[PDB]
Design a protein around this nucleic acid. Structure first.
Lengths: 144, 185, 217, 48
RNA sequence: GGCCCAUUCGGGUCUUGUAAUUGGAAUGAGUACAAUGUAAAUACCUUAACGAGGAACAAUUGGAGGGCAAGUCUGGUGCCAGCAGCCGCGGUAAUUCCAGCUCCAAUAGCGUAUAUUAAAGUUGUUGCAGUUAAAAAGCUCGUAGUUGAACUUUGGGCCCGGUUGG
């Protein structure tokens, strides 16, 4: 008999069980409780600006092994701090500090059995100039 | 404030991007007819796939049902008036097997090459763009005119173009101003 | 050359059977692949998937090659077989012969009204094998075939122009998917529709009208 | 590095043709001629 | 190549291929007398004179093991190595990093980020899951809520008047 009621005047059990155990869909519970403000470092935004504390070097332990270059930062609207990532100056020659930077996220989920370890962010521009415009060398960093 | 101005989008891309048996039949239409990109071929499949949907449900409701008779005999009447349905195929089931080049063979780029004015299908789209061809009295310059049926027979050159009319362009005038005055010196 | 060694084969070598439908009416078993070739000369194949597969005999890893081959007309006849073999080009040609051996018809009907040829299926049908289900549904004109590419290619060679599919189950082991679309076609002759309600008398087999012929020495 | 500001227009390889003419070129290079490698097919190949 | 005169030539018809091999025609982007527009102007429609071999009046973003269209190509001492959503590719010469060449896709890129919808029969009324895979409460009485056997005027006769196959 399927283990659910079928008769005609039964619409109240049917609609009150459905929102009862709709709380196991994993990203409907995130939306009604609203955990995007209370826990996320961004608060619900695409990008965010911070100011860089210092250069860091991080490594990936099991099967892979090389020299992943990341950066500390401190967000202006929040005060909390995160560790971003800068893409492929694999030459080890773009340290920069006490600068204004713009982060973003990865399209995130991954595999860290090679231990490409636990950061969640990246960098799209720095001090008012895009990153690729420096790597492809279309601008150079503004200063006097 | 004021009233808002309606608009609509006119094409739609397909669901699977890189699969090969699609990609070639689109290519062989773009070389056959000379079309700029594949947005021009999506433009003709959209317009078709709303015609097909419009007849797809008048077939469901009964015959001798006065919405089938008023909206049917107008949809049929408009497709013949531009010349896509054959004149013996005036029945509503026959539009459900219409194809996409039965509209592609009615553009001005295609109906001027068949009617003997340009030596190739790429001599059409450059003849039209440069204001040479004029159905009726009106210089058109759009390679997608979709000529109505009882005005296939009016296309000719323009009463302003150097081909079918008056003064030559500013090469021949410039060449005559490069040689005829230079005959003495 | 061709020596028939089965007593159906002598009847068709001598040319007492002109269409394949006499095999299908009295439902006769077929065991020689040359019978189909003279009967249906327009038959035509493609290969779907070729996969190396492995057996750890003597801890010596000997390679086989499984092949999935569909043969078929563009009128109403299909076929499908699978064969593993030691060498690649043997598995294709051995895979064709089982597919030539298993040919079935398909009832092709209309959607709605009755103008001209049949295009779509007669009713809705379903076959399941393994864990996959596949269900086929009639469609109007202009529809085309909406299926996965491995199943759309099957239904071209049976020549259905418009049909609607809907498939459940783990559809990512294609040896089992095609073995469900196959069952879901071959049931189309088997649903007793109401026009097939009338009565007819039983015909008699060719295997005893021509009994003096096609008999061994 | 940057753009040059003086581009006023009042008063190694040869080019490719850009636009509808490029669709004409591709129509020839795969549908008016042929390329095989012994029936088996590796068109637009590596030179060997 | 090609259809053919083929004798065999070339006798025709073609199709490309290319020859910094050669010729002449077309034209608006732009500029600008007038007129028209407009409350006055600016611009779009119309139009004197001017305006190209175009090599310069020069299309761009992203990729070329797999999913998923596209390379068996040469160069680093690993100049300028984790490495590309996820399986993974590095321990010299790599069928993926860094660059040159040639190809592919969209042509004004949907390139990246974050939300949501389809894919999803992974929210299931239509429509899922019962033993071994997540999942039937220790056991019977019993609220509200949901759900509850069959039966009480059928048949017969006459006659008018609809639109359909005719």
């Amino acid at each position: 008999g399927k283990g659910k009621p079928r008769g005609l005047n039964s619409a109240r059990k049917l609609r009150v069980h459905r929102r009862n155990n709709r709380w196991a869909e994993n990203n409907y519970k995130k939306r009604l409780l609203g955990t995007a403000f209370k826990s996320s470092p961004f608060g619900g935004s695409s990008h965010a600006k911070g100011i860089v504390l210092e250069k860091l070097g991080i490594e990936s332990k099991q099967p892979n092994s090389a020299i992943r270059k990341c950066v500390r930062v401190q967000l202006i609207k929040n005060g909390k701090k995160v560790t971003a990532f800068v893409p492929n100056d694999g030459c080890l020659n773009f340290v920069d500090e006490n600068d204004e930077v713009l982060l973003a996220g990865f399209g995130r989920k991954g595999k860290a059995k090679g231990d490409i370890p636990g950061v969640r962010f990246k960098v799209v521009k720095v001090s008012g100039v895009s990153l690729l415009a420096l790597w492809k060398e279309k601008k150079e960093k503004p200063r006097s | 404030p004021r009233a808002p101005r309606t608009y609509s989008k006119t094409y739609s891309t397909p669901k699977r991007p890189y699969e090969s048996s699609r990609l070639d039949a689109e290519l062989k239409l773009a070389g056959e007819f000379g079309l700029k990109n594949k947005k021009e071929i999506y433009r003709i499949s959209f317009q078709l796939s709303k015609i097909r949907r419009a007849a797809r449900d008048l077939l469901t409701r009964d015959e001798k049902d006065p919405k089938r008779l008023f909206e049917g005999n107008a949809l049929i009447r408009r497709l013949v008036r531009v010349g896509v349905l054959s004149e013996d195929k005036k029945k509503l089931d026959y539009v459900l097997a219409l194809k996409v080049e039965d509209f592609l063979e009615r553009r001005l780029q295609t109906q001027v090459y068949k009617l003997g004015l340009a030596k190739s299908v790429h001599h059409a789209r450059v003849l039209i763009t440069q204001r040479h061809i004029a159905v009726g009295k009106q210089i058109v310059n759009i390679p997608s005119f979709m000529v109505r049926l009882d005005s296939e027979k009016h296309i000719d050159f323009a009463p302003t173009s150097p081909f079918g009319g008056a003064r030559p362009g500013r090469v021949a005038r410039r060449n005559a101003a490069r040689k005829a005055e230079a005959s003495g010196e | 050359g061709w020596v028939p060694v089965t007593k159906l084969g002598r009847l068709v070598k001598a040319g007492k059977i002109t269409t394949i439908e006499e095999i299908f009416l009295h439902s006769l078993p077929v065991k020689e692949f040359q019978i189909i070739d003279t009967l249906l000369p327009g038959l035509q194949d493609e290969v779907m998937n070729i996969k190396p597969v492995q057996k750890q005999t003597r801890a010596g890893q000997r390679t086989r090659f499984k092949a999935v081959v569909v043969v078929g007309d563009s009128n109403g006849h299909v076929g499908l077989g699978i064969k593993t073999a030691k060498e690649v080009a043997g598995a294709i040609r051995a895979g064709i012969i089982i597919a030539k051996l298993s040919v079935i018809p398909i009832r092709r009907g209309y959607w709605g009204t009755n103008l001209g040829q049949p295009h779509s299926l007669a009713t809705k049908t379903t076959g399941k094998c393994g864990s996959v289900t596949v269900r086929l549904i009639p469609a109007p004109r202009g529809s085309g075939i909406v299926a996965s590419p491995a199943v759309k290619k099957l239904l071209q060679l049976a020549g259905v122009e418009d049909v609607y599919t809907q498939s459940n189950g783990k559809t990512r082991t294609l040896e089992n998917t095609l073995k469900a679309a196959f069952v879901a076609i071959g049931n189309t002759y088997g649903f007793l529709t109401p026009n097939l309600w009338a009565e007819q008398p039983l015909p008699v087999s060719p295997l005893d009208i021509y009994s003096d012929e096609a008999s061994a020495q | 590095m940057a753009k040059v500001h003086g581009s006023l227009a009042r008063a190694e390889k040869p080019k490719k043709p850009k636009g509808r003419a490029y669709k004409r070129l591709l129509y020839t290079r795969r549908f008016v001629n042929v390329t095989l490698v012994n029936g088996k097919r590796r068109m637009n190949p590596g030179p060997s």
